Design a protein around this nucleic acid. Structure first.
Ligand code: MG
Ligand code: ZN
Lengths: 37, 120, 286
RNA sequence: AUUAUUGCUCUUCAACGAGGAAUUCCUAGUAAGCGCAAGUCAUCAGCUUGCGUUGAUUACGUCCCUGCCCUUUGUACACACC
RNA sequence: ACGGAAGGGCACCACCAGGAGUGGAGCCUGCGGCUUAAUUUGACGGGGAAACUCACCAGGUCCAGACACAAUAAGGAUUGACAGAUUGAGAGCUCUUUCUUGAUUUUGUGGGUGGUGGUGCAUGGCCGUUCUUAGUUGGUGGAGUGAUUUGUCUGCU
């Protein structure tokens, strides 16, 4: 499940981060992923 | 004057109620209603699984066409039998929670009864 | 699209009010609230507003509040259920639900009646929705057209589905236990069936019609017995039909025949020995 | 691993002789043909997203239909009369 | 407001000229439908996938009650270590032991503990959408008793 919002769904299980796409899009800027292009 | 003869009272009569002779009419029919009660178990965005209103799947088959009404004021109908225990899937008008009651209304003919004169 | 189920949620009153909006939108563009209150022939705001709440919840009507101009808009479902209610009244349809035939200007479902005899429902959807007057009106005229053509096709002996009813843009027809030229594998008497399918185009150009598109999927073939193998050659073609006076009737007719012979040549390996009937003989035949 | 995950060997060789009404997508390293990699992934695509390889035809027009608008204008039917 | 008066854009989810096609075929895969004890379910769900994921089925199990309160109980109310009996499909489950026992009571009542009870009200707020603002606004001034108007326009761009 997504280690942020109790969600079985949306999971980005890649690289061992396991945040669903909705929360990972928000935490993207704090993780290191920024908008270039 | 409607009364029920009670020996104990001073007046040997318990006065129940009053009114008027209205109508000499047979056209009045009287349907004994009969309500079947069931709990809406599980919820999907259009289909509600309902619990404890039957206990056989064939029973559910038998009552398929009969409409389902909820005291929350909402209509619906049955779909098909889930388990071998009478669970049944159902569709409805609004969105119902586990605090509602799904119900069936079945009716029977009720007949007037013969009367005998009263003396003393 | 069509969700026939919901119709058995409505009472006498909700149909009453929906009918009132049907008489009120064919008189004025957007039927306001008081129009529905006064035309419906009802008692109070109780029945009418409760009815309209039902219709609006079940997507039979849309509330248009255009700068104080309050009004209502009958969706396609409303028209559907009013035709279907008219048929429930005319004892023609009792149950619905199995889709075989998703055409462009026609939807084909499988229905039943009081007696249990299976039938078919061709509703007409011109533009499927940004509803004006022309979409609904021309769909209504479309099914009127096709039902009249159909009645003249059943009347004159042609093996074409018997038209039972034409509730507005919806048409009730006979279910035909048949199979198209695609699903058919082989036949016991292919030359007789070709003779039939040619004699038919002959008699059709004798009537005054040239069903421009006479392909493989068009022609249904109904089986009546399994021991003796009885066939029946049903044909679905009416808005694509082209009269025998049009400038282009020639290659239409001869395309029909060339398709008959080309399929009978490929699938059943049966080529016709007699020369194909040209347009001219059938231009004199009518 | 049965209702066969998949891979390999032999055998069976069905339909399908450019496809009706109709309809999608596309103007240059682009369409199309071609595979590869990465995500799902323990086994797999015919799934998706990129990648490179080969590389055309046809415009560079228009409002015909599709829409999207923005003007001008008459008007709420200011709920006109039948 | 609305027009189905007209006028312009300006567009390969529009049309031309094509290109590749699809629709016909087998197979795949999703949706519906039927069938089912269940064929979980939403309208791509990261919805890839024999256990898992399972949210659906046929059965077999546990664990219930905070507490209050009345009887029992120590000369027994009943909790823990085991071995065979077990034992059905797999586990438990119970009673004869060697044993710990040792009040955790066993049983029956009530308003609610339990809210690892979910629904609603108010309040703060975070993520999703829209007029997805892409022509508006208001400020003084003029005109009108007023709704309103001018700005926000003939022109041309
Ligand atoms: Mg001012
Ligand atoms: Zn999350």
């Amino acid at each position: 499940q997504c280690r942020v919002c109790s969600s079985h769904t949306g999971l980005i299980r890649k690289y061992g981060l396991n945040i669903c796409r909705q929360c990972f899009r928000e935490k993207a800027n704090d993780i290191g992923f920024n908008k270039f292009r | 004057i409607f009364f029920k003869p009670s020996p104990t009272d001073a007046k040997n009569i318990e006065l129940i109620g009053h009114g008027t002779f209205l109508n000499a009419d047979h056209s009045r029919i009287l349907a004994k209603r009969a309500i079947l009660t069931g709990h809406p178990f599980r919820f999907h965005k259009t289909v509600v699984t309902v619990r404890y209103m039957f206990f056989r799947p064939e029973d559910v088959e038998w009552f398929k066409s009969i409409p389902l009404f909820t005291k929350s004021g909402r209509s619906g109908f049955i779909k098909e039998s889930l388990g071998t225990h009478g669970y049944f899937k159902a569709t409805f008008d609004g969105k119902l929670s586990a605090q509602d009651v799904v119900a069936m209304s079945l009716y029977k003919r009720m007949w007037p009864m013969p009367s005998l004169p009263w003396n003393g | 699209k069509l969700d026939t189920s919901h119709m058995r949620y409505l009472t006498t009153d909700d149909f009453r009010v929906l009918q009132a909006v049907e008489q009120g939108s064919r008189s004025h563009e957007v039927v306001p609230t008081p129009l529905i209150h006064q035309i419906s022939g009802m008692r109070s705001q109780s029945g009418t507003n409760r009815a309209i709440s039902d219709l609006a919840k079940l997507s039979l009507i849309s509330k248009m509040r255009n700068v104080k101009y309050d009004g209502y808009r009958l969706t396609y479902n409303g028209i559907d259920y009013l035709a279907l209610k008219t048929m429930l009244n005319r004892d023609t349809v009792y149950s619905v639900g199995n889709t075989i035939g998703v055409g462009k200007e026609s939807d084909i479902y499988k229905v039943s009646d009081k007696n249990g005899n299976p039938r078919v429902m061709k509703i007409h959807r011109l533009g499927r929705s940004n509803q004006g007057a022309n979409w609904m009106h021309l769909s209504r005229l479309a099914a009127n057209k096709e039902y009249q053509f159909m009645s003249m096709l059943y009347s004159k002996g042609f093996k074409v589905p018997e038209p039972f009813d034409n509730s507005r843009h919806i048409v009730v027809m006979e279910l035909i236990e048949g199979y198209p030229m695609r699903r058919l594998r082989k036949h016991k008497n292919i030359p007789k069936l070709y003779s039939d399918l040619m004699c038919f185009i002959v008699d059709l150009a004798n009537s005054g019609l040239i069903h421009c598109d006479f392909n493989e999927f068009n022609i249904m073939i109904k089986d009546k017995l399994e021991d003796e193998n009885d066939c029946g050659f049903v044909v679905i073609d009416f808005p694509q039909c082209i009269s025998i006076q049009h400038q282009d009737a020639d290659y239409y007719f001869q395309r029909d025949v060339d398709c008959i012979r080309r399929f009978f040549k490929k699938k059943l390996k049966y080529e016709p020995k007699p020369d194909s009937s040209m347009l001219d003989t059938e231009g004199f035949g009518d």
